[PDB]
Design a protein around this motif. Structure first.
Motif, PDB file in Angstrom:
ATOM      1  N   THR A   1      -9.461  -0.983  -3.437  1.00 31.74           N
ATOM      2  CA  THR A   1      -8.198  -0.279  -3.170  1.00 31.74           C
ATOM      3  C   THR A   1      -7.578  -0.918  -1.949  1.00 31.74           C
ATOM      4  N   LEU A   2      -6.237  -0.959  -1.870  1.00 34.95           N
ATOM      5  CA  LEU A   2      -5.552  -1.565  -0.727  1.00 34.95           C
ATOM      6  C   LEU A   2      -5.924  -0.935   0.619  1.00 34.95           C
ATOM      7  N   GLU A   3      -6.330   0.359   0.622  1.00 34.90           N
ATOM      8  CA  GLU A   3      -6.747   1.089   1.817  1.00 34.90           C
ATOM      9  C   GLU A   3      -8.092   0.562   2.328  1.00 34.90           C
TER      10      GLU A   3
ATOM     11  N   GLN B   1       0.872  -1.170   0.000  1.00 32.77           N
ATOM     12  CA  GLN B   1       0.000   0.000   0.000  1.00 32.77           C
ATOM     13  C   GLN B   1       0.911   1.223   0.000  1.00 32.77           C
TER      14      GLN B   1
ATOM     15  N   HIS C   1       2.242   2.054  -3.320  1.00 31.99           N
ATOM     16  CA  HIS C   1       1.165   2.670  -4.096  1.00 31.99           C
ATOM     17  C   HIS C   1       0.901   4.114  -3.672  1.00 31.99           C
ATOM     18  N   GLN C   2       1.109   4.390  -2.391  1.00 34.10           N
ATOM     19  CA  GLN C   2       0.980   5.677  -1.731  1.00 34.10           C
ATOM     20  C   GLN C   2       1.964   6.669  -2.379  1.00 34.10           C
TER      21      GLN C   2
ATOM     22  N   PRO D   1      -2.997   2.932   6.538  1.00 38.90           N
ATOM     23  CA  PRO D   1      -1.861   3.171   5.625  1.00 38.90           C
ATOM     24  C   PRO D   1      -0.601   3.558   6.390  1.00 38.90           C
TER      25      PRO D   1
END
Ligand SMILES: CC1(C)C(=O)N([C@H]2C=Cc3c(O)cccc32)c2nc(Nc3ccccc3)ncc21
Length: 302
Positions: free
Chosen positions: A233-235, A117, A120-121, A254
């Motif tokens: 979404t991973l979040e 994540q 991706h952040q 996150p």
């Protein structure tokens, strides 16, 4: 046996004109893993992909991603001094111990999900998550490998339908495969031929192990979604009930990067005595140079 402030000990592996040698930081005694790429060999494309990795390693500071300490550059060869993961491959652990209990798999998967994540952040996509690609430290903590063979069962369906394949939702599919592998010790999509591998991956249906919990199987349903757009979404997958069993106190949030401490007085005096100037210490750190000054500082924080 000597490069910089380093003593090359064993050889954790060789390969594609790159040799990863286990080493010891001379001035701090701290153990490192040195990647030795012979740039002369590397084809035109493999170099851009090597430089893209260097650029990425320099940016990620997560406790579940291999930390980069130094970059030693020569015309002919490149030396990447990274964090050593003693436990070896997760793939080799899963073959040696079989499947992990959901409790144990959760411990490692939280670390994986957080680290991916966090990538991706910062708009960094791995695109190649494998069990071989994940390492374990001395305390069984995930240490994700490098960004630049069992590559096809982790392939997203969008690979077989020619569609774009540039997004982060590619890693979400892959992460789902990894979760499945961690709890079952096998692959969800198998085949003898790649025509068979493709037919399974595109069908999206996987074998569910008789022992798998309804919660775990649900999380797989959050990852292994055929339409990339329809993938979570991973979040939002972080908030999943399976993810937080036992962590009813600390929900997966996150990764919030720690603030920079380029002025620690313990490490700075040590380095001032070592002959380094306070001046060059701060400049190397602020400039994020990954030189012998920065590596000496990063490695002193242990
Ligand atoms: C520098 C870095 C990140 C790296 O490039 N590798 C290589 C080298 C062998 C290998 C592999 O077998 C699987 C993945 C990555 C790699 C590393 N391997 C380790 N530990 C280890 C220890 C016992 C067995 C395997 C890996 N620590 C750090 C690294």
């Amino acid at each position: 046996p000597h490069i910089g402030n380093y003593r090359l000990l064993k050889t954790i592996g060789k390969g594609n004109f790159a040799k990863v040698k286990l080493a010891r930081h001379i001035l701090t005694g701290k153990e490192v893993a040195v990647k030795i790429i012979d740039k002369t060999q590397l084809n035109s494309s493999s170099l851009q992909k090597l430089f893209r990795e260097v650029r990425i390693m320099k940016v990620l500071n997560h406790p579940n991603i291999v930390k980069l300490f130094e970059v030693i550059e020569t015309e002919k060869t490149l030396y990447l001094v990274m964090e050593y993961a003693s436990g070896g491959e997760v793939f080799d652990y899963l073959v040696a111990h079989g499947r992990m209990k959901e409790k144990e798999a959760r411990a490692k998967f939280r670390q994986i999900v957080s680290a991916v994540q966090y990538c991706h952040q910062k708009f960094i996509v791995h695109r190649d998550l494998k069990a071989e690609n994940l390492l374990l430290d001395a305390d069984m903590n995930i240490k994700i490998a490098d960004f630049g063979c069992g590559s096809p069962p982790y392939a997203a369906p969008e690979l077989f339908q020619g569609k774009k394949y540039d997004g982060p939702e590619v890693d979400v599919w892959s992460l789902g495969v990894i979760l499945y592998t961690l709890v079952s010790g096998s692959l969800p999509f198998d085949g003898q031929n790649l025509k068979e591998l493709r037919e399974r991956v595109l069908r999206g249906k996987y074998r569910i192990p008789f022992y798998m919990s309804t919660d775990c199987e649900n999380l797989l349903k959050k990852f292994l979604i055929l339409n990339p757009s329809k993938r979570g979404t991973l979040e939002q997958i972080m908030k999943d009930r399976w993810m937080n069993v036992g962590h009813e106190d600390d929900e997966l949030k996150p990764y919030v990067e720690p603030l920079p401490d380029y002025k620690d007085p313990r490490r700075t005096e040590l380095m001032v005595s070592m002959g380094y100037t306070r001046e060059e210490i701060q400049d190397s750190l602020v400039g994020q140079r990954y030189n012998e000054v920065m590596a000496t500082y990063l490695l002193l924080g242990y």
